[PDB]
PDB file of C-alpha atoms and ligand atoms in Angstrom:
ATOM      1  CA  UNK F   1     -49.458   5.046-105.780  1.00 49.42           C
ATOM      2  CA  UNK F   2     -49.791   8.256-104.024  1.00 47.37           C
ATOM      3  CA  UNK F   3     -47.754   8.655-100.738  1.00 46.66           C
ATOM      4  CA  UNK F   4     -51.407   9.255 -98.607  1.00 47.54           C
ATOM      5  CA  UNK F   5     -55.151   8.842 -99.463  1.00 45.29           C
ATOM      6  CA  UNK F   6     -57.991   9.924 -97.763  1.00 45.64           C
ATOM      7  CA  UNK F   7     -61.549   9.095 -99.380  1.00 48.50           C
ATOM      8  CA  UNK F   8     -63.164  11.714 -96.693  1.00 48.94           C
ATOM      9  CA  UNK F   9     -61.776  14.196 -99.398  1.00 51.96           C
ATOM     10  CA  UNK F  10     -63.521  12.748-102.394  1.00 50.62           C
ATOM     11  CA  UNK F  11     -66.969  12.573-100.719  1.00 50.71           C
ATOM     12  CA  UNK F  12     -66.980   8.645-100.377  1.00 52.82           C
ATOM     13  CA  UNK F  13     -67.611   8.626 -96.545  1.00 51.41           C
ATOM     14  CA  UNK F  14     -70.324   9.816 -93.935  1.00 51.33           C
ATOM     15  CA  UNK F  15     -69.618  10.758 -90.789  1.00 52.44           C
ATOM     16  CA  UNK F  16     -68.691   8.989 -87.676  1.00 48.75           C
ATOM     17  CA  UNK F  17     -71.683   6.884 -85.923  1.00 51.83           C
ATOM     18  CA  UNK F  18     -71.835   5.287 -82.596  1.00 52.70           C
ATOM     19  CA  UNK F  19     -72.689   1.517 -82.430  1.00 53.06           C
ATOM     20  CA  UNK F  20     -73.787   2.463 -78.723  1.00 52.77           C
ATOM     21  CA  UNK F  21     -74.429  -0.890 -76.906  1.00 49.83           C
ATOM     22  CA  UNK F  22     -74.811  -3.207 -79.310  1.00 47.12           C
ATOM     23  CA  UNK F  23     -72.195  -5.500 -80.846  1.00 51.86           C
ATOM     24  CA  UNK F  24     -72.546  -4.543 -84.188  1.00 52.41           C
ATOM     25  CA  UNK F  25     -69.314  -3.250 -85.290  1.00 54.92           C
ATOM     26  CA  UNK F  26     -69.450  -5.847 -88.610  1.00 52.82           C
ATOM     27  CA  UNK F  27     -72.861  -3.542 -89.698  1.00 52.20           C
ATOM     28  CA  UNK F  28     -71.249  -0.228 -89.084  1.00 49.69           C
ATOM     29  CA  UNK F  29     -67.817  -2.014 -91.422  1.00 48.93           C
ATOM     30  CA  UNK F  30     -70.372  -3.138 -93.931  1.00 49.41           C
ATOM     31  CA  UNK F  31     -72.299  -0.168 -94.666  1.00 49.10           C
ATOM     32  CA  UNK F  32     -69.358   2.286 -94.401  1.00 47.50           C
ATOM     33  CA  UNK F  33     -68.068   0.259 -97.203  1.00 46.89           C
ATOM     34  CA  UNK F  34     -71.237  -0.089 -99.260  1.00 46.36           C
ATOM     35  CA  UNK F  35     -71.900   4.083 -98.726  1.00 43.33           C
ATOM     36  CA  UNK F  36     -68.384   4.120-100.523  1.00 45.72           C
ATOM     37  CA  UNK F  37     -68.610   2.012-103.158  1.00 47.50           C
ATOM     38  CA  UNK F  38     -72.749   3.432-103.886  1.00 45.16           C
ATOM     39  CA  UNK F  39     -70.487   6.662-103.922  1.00 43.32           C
ATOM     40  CA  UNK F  40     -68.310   5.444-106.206  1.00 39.94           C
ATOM     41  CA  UNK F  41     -71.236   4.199-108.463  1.00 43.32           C
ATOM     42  CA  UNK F  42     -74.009   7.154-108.485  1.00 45.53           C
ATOM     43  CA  UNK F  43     -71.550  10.449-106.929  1.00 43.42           C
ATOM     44  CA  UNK F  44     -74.349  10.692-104.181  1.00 43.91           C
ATOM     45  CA  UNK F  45     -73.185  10.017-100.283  1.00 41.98           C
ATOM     46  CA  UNK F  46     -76.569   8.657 -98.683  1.00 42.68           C
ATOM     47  CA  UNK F  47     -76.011   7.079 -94.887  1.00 42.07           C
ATOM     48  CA  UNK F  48     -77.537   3.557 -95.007  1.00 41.44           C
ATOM     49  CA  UNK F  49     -79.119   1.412 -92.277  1.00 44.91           C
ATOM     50  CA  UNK F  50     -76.648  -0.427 -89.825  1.00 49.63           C
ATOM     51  CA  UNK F  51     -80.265  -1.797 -88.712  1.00 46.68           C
ATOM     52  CA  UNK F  52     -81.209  -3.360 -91.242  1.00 44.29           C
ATOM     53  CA  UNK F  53     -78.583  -5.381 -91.130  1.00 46.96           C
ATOM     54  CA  UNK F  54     -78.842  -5.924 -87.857  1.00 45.64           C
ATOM     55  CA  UNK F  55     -82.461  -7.138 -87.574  1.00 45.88           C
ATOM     56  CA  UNK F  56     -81.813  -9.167 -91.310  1.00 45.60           C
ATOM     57  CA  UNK F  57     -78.940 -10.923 -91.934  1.00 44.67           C
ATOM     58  CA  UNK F  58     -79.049 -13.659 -89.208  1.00 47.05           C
ATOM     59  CA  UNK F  59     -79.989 -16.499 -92.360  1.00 46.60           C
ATOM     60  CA  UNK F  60     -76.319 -15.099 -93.698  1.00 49.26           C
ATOM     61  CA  UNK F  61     -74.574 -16.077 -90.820  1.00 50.64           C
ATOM     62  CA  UNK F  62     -74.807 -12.914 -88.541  1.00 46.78           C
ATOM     63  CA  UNK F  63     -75.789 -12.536 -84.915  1.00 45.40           C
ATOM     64  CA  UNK F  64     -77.556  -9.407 -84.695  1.00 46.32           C
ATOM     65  CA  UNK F  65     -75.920  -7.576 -81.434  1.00 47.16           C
ATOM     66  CA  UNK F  66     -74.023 -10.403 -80.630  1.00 47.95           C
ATOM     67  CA  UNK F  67     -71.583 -10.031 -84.041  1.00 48.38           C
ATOM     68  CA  UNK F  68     -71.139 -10.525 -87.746  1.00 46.47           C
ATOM     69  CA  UNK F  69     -69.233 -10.947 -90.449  1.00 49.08           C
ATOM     70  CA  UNK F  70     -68.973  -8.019 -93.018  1.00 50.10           C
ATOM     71  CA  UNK F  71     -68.985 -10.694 -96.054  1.00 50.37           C
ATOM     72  CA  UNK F  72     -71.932 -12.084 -94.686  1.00 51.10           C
ATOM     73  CA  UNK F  73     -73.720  -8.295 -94.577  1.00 49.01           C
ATOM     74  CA  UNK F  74     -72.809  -7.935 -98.276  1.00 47.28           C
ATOM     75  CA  UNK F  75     -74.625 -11.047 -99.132  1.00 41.77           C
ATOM     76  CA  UNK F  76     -77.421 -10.273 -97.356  1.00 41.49           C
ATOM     77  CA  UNK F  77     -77.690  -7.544 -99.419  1.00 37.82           C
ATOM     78  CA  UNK F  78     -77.265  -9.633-102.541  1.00 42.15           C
ATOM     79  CA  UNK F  79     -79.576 -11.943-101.393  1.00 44.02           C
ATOM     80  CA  UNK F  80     -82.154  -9.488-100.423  1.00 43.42           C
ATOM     81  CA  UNK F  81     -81.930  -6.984-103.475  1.00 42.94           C
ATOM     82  CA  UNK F  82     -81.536  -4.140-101.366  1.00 41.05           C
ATOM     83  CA  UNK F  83     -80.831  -2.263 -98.014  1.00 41.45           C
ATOM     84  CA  UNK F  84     -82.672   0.587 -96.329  1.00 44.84           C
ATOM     85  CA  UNK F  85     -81.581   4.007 -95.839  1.00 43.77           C
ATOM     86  CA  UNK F  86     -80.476   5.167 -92.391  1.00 43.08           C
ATOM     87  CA  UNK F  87     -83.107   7.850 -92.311  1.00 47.43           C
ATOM     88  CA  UNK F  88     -86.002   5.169 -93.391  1.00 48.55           C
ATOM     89  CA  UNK F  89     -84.912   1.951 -91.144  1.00 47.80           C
ATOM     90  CA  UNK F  90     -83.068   4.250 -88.157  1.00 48.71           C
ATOM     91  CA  UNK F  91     -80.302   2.761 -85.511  1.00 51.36           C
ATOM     92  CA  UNK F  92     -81.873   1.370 -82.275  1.00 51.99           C
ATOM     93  CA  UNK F  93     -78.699  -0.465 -80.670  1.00 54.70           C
ATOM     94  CA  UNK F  94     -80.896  -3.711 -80.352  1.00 56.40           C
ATOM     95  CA  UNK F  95     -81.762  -6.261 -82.397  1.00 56.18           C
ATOM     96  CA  UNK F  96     -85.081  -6.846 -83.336  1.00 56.05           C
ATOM     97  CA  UNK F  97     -87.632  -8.554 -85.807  1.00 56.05           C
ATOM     98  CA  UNK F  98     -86.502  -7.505 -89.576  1.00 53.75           C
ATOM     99  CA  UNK F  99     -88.570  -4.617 -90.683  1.00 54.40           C
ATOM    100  CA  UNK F 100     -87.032  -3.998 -94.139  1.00 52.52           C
ATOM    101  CA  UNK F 101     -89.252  -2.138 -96.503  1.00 54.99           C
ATOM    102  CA  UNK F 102     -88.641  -2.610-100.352  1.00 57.78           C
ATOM    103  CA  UNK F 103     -90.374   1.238-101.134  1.00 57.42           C
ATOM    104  CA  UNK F 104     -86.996   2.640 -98.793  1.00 56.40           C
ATOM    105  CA  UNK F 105     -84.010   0.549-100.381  1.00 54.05           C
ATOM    106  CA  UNK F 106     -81.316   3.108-101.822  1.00 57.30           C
ATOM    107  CA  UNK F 107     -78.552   0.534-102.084  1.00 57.59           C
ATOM    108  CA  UNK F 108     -77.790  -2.505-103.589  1.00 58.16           C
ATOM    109  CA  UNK F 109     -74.777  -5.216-104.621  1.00 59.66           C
ATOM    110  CA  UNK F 110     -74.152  -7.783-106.573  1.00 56.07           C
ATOM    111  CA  UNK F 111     -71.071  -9.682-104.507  1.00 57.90           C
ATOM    112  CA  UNK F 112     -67.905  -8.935-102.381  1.00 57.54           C
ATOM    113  CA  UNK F 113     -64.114  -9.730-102.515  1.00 55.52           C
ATOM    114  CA  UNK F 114     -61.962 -10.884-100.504  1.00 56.79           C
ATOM    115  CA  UNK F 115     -58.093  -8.991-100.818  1.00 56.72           C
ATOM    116  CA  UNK F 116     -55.579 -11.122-100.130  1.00 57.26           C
ATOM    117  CA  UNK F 117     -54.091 -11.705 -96.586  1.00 55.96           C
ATOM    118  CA  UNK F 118     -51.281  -9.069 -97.810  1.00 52.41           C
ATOM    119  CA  UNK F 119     -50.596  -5.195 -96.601  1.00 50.81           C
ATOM    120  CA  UNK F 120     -49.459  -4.405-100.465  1.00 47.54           C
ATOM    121  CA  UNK F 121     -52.718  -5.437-101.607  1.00 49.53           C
ATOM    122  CA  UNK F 122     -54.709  -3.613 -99.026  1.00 51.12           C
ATOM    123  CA  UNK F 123     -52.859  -0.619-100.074  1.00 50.33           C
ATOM    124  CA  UNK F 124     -53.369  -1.317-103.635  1.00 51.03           C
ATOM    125  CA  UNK F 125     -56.984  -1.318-103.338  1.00 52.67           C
ATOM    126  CA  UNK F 126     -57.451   1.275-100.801  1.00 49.60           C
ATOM    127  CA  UNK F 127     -55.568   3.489-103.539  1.00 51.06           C
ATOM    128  CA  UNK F 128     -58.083   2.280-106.328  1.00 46.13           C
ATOM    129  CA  UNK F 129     -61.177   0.996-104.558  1.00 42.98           C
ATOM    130  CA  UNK F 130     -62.744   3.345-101.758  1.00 44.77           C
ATOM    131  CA  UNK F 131     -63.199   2.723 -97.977  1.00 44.75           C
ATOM    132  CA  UNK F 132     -61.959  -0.914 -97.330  1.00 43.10           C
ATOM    133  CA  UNK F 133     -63.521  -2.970 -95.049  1.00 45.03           C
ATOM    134  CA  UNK F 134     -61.205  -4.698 -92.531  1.00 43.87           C
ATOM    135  CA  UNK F 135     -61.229  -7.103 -89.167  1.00 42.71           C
ATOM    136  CA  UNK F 136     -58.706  -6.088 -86.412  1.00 41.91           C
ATOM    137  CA  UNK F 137     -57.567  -7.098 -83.160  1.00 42.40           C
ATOM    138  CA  UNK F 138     -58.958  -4.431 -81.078  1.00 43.35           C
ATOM    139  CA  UNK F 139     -58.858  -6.704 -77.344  1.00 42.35           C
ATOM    140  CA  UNK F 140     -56.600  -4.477 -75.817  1.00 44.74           C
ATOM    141  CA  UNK F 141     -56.780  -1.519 -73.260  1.00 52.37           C
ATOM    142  CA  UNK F 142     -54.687   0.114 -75.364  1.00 52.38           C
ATOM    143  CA  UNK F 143     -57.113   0.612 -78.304  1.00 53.42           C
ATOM    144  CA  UNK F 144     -60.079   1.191 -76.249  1.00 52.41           C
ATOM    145  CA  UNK F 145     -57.901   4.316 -74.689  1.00 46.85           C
ATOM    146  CA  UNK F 146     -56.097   5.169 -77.905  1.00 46.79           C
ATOM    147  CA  UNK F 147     -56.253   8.896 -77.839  1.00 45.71           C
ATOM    148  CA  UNK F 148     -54.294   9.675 -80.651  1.00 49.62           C
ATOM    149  CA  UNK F 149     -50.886   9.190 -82.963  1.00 50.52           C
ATOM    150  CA  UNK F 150     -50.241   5.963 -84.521  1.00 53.77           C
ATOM    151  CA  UNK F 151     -51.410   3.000 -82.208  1.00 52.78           C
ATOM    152  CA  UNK F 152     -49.255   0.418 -82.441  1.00 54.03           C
ATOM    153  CA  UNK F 153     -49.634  -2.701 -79.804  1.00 54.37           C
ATOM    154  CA  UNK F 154     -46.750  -5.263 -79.433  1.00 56.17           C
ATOM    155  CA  UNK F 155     -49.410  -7.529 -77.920  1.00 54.13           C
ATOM    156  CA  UNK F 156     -51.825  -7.188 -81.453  1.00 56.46           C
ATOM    157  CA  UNK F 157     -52.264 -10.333 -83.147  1.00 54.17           C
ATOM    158  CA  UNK F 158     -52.592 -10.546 -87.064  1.00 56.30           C
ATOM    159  CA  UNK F 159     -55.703 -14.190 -86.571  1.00 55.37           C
ATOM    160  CA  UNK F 160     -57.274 -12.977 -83.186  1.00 57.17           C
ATOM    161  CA  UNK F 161     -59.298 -10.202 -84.734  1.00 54.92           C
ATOM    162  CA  UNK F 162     -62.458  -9.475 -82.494  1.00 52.25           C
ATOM    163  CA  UNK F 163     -63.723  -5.952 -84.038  1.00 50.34           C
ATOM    164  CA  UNK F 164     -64.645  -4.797 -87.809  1.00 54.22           C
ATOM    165  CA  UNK F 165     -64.006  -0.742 -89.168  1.00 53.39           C
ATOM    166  CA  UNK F 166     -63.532   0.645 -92.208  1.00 57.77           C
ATOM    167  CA  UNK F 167     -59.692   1.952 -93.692  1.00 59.40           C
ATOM    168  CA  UNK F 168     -60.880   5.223 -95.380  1.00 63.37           C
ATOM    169  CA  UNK F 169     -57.204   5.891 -96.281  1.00 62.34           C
ATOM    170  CA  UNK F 170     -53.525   5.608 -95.562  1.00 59.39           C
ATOM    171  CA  UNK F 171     -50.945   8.180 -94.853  1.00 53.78           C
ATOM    172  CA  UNK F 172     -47.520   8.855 -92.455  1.00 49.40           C
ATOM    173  CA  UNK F 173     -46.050  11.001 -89.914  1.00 49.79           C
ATOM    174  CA  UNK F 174     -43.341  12.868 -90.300  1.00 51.30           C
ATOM    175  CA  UNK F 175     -40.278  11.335 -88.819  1.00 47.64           C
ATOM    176  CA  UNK F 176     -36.547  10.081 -89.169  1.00 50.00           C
ATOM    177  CA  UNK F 177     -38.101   7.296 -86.743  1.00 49.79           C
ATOM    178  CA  UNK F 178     -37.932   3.885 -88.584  1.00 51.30           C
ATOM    179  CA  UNK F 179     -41.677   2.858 -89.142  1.00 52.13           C
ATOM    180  CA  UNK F 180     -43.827   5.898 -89.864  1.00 51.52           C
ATOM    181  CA  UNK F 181     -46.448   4.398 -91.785  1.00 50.24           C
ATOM    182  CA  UNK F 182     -50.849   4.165 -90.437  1.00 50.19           C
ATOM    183  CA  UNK F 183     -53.689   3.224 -91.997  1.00 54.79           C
ATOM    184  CA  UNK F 184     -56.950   5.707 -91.623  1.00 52.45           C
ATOM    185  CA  UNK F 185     -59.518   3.758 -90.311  1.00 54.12           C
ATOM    186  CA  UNK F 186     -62.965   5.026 -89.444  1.00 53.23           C
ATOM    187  CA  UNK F 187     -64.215   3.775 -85.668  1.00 52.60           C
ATOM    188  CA  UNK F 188     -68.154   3.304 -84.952  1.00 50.88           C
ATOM    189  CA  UNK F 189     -67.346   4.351 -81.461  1.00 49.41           C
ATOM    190  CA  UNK F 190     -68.876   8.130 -82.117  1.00 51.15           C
ATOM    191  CA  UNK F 191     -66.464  11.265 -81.737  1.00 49.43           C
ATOM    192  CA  UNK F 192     -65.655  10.793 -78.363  1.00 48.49           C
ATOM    193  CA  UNK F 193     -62.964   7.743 -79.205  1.00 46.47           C
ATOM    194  CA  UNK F 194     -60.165   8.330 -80.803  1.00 45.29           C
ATOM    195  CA  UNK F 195     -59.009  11.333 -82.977  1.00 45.15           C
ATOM    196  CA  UNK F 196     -62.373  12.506 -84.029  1.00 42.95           C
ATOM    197  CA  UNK F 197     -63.312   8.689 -83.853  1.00 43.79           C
ATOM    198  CA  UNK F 198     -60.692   7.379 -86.167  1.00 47.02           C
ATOM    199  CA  UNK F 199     -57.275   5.629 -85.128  1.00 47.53           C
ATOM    200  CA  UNK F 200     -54.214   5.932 -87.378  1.00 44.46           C
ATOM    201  CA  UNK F 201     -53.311   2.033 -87.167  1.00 48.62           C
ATOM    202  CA  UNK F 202     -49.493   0.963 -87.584  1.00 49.35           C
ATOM    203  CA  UNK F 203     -49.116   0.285 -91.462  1.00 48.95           C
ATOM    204  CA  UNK F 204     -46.673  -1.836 -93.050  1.00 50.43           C
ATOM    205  CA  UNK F 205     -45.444  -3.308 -89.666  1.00 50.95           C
ATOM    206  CA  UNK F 206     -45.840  -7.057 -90.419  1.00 52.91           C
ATOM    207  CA  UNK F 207     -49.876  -6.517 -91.105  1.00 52.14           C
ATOM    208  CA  UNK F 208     -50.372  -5.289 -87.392  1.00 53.06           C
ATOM    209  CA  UNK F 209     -53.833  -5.912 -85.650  1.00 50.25           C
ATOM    210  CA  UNK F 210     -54.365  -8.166 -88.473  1.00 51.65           C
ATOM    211  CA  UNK F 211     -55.869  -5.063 -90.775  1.00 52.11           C
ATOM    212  CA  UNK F 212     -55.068  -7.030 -93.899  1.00 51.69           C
ATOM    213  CA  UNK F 213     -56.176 -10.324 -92.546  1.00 47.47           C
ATOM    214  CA  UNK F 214     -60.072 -10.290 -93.754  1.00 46.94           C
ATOM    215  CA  UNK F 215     -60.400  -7.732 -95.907  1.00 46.17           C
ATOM    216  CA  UNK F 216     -63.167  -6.903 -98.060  1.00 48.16           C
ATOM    217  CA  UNK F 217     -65.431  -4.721-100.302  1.00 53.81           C
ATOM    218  CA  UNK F 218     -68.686  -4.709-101.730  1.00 53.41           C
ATOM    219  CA  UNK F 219     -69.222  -4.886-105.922  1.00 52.21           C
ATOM    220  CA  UNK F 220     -72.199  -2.660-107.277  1.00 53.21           C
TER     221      UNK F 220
HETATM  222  C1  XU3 G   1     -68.349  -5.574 -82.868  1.00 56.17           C
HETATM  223  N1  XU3 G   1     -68.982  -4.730 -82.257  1.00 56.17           N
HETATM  224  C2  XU3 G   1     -67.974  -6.934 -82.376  1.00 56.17           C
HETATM  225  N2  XU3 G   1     -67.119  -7.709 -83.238  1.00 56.17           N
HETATM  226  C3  XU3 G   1     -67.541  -8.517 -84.241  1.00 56.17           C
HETATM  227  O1  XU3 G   1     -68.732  -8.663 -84.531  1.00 56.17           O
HETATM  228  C4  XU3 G   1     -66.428  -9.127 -85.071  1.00 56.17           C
HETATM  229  C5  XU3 G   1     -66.451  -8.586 -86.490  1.00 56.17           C
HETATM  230  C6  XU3 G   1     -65.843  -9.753 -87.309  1.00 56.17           C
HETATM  231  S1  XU3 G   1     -64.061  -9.590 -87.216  1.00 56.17           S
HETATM  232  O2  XU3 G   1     -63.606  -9.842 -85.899  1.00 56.17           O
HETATM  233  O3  XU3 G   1     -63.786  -8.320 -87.828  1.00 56.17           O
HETATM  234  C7  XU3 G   1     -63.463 -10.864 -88.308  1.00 56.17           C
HETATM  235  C8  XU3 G   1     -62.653 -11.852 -87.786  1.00 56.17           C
HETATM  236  C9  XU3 G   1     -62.149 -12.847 -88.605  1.00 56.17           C
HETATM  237  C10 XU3 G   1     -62.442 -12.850 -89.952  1.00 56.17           C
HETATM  238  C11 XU3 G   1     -63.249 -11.870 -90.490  1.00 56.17           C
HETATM  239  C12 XU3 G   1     -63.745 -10.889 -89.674  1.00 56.17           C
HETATM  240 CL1  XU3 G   1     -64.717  -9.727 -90.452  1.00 56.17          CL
HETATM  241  C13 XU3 G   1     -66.292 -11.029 -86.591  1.00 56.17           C
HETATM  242  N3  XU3 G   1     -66.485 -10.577 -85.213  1.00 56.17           N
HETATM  243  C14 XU3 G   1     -66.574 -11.366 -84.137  1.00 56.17           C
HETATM  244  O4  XU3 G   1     -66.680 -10.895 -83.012  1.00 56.17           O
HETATM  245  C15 XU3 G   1     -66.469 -12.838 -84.392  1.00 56.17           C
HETATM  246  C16 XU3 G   1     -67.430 -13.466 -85.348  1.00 56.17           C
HETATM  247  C17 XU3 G   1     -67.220 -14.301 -86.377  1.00 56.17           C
HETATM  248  C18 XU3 G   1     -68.383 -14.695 -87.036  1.00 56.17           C
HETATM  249  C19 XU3 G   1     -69.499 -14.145 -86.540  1.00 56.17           C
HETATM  250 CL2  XU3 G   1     -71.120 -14.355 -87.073  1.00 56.17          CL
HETATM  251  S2  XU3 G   1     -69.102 -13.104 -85.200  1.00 56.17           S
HETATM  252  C20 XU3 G   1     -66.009 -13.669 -83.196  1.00 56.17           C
HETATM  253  C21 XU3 G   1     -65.056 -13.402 -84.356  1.00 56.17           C
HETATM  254  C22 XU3 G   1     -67.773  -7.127 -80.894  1.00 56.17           C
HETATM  255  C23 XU3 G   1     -69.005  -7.714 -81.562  1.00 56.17           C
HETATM  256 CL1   CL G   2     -69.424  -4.251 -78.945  1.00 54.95          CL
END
């Protein structure tokens, strides 16, 4: 595999969005994803509608501002034969009655796997796949006022995950320092977090923050 990847440089991702004040982290996960793999299908990057989801998928399990599951966006999807685009169906931070519109669907899948609970087959199918989405264990001041470098939080836990992003790639620093290793993971916290609103999270450090605990990507 090759020593870094960053899908940003093939065209599979959009740029960083801001879930504002609503707790719908799993939506932003999902259709990061979903842009990717739509990417990978038909070479054209179109943004697609984190409300939608929102508003929709409560009969899949999700909880509109409250939280979801990214497995349970991709079957809504499924289920519903389509999702809107961002420009047609645009973010309001607030869930509200479902107002998805057939005419305006510009995505669609047809399931979702689940990788294995293993950091080797994360990496194997962020090499091969696109954008990854992934469940972390972001319930820690740390992450909230991660800045930059690699974040790395002795007090992360690999079951407690609490917050859903995307890993767009993987890569290291350079360093005789034992442990040099991050995933590039995509925030939906806008620019203002982060580095550019991405984190370089520890990689290969006994599946840190739980990146490689749940997983997932969309089929197309
Ligand atoms: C995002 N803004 C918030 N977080 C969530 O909605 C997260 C996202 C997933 S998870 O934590 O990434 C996850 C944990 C374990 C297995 C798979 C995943 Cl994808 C779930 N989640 C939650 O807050 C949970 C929910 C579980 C089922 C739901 Cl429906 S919501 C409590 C774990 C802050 C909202
Ligand atoms: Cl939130």
């Amino acid at each position: 595999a090759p020593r870094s990847v960053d899908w940003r440089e093939k065209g599979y991702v959009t740029p960083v969005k801001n879930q504002g004040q609503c707790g719908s982290c799993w939506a932003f996960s999902a259709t990061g994803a979903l842009e990717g793999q739509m990417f990978r299908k038909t070479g054209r990057l179109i943004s697609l509608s984190e409300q939608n989801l929102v508003d929709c998928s409560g009969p899949q399990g999700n909880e509109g501002c409250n939280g979801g599951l990214m497995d349970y966006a991709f079957q809504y999807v499924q289920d519903n034969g389509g999702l809107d685009s961002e420009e047609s169906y645009p973010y309001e931070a607030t869930e509200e009655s479902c107002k998805y519109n057939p005419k305006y669907s510009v995505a669609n899948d047809t399931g979702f796997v689940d990788i294995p609970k293993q950091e080797k087959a994360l990496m194997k199918a962020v090499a091969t796949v696109g954008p990854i989405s992934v469940a972390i264990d972001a319930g820690h001041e740390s992450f909230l006022f991660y800045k930059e470098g690699i974040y790395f939080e002795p007090d992360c836990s690999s079951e407690d995950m609490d917050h859903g992003v995307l890993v767009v790639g993987y890569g290291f620093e350079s360093t005789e320092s034992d442990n040099n290793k991050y995933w590039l993971v995509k925030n939906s916290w806008g620019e203002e977090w982060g580095m550019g609103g991405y984190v370089k999270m520890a990689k290969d450090r006994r599946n840190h923050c739980g990146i490689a605990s749940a997983a997932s990507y969309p089929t197309v």
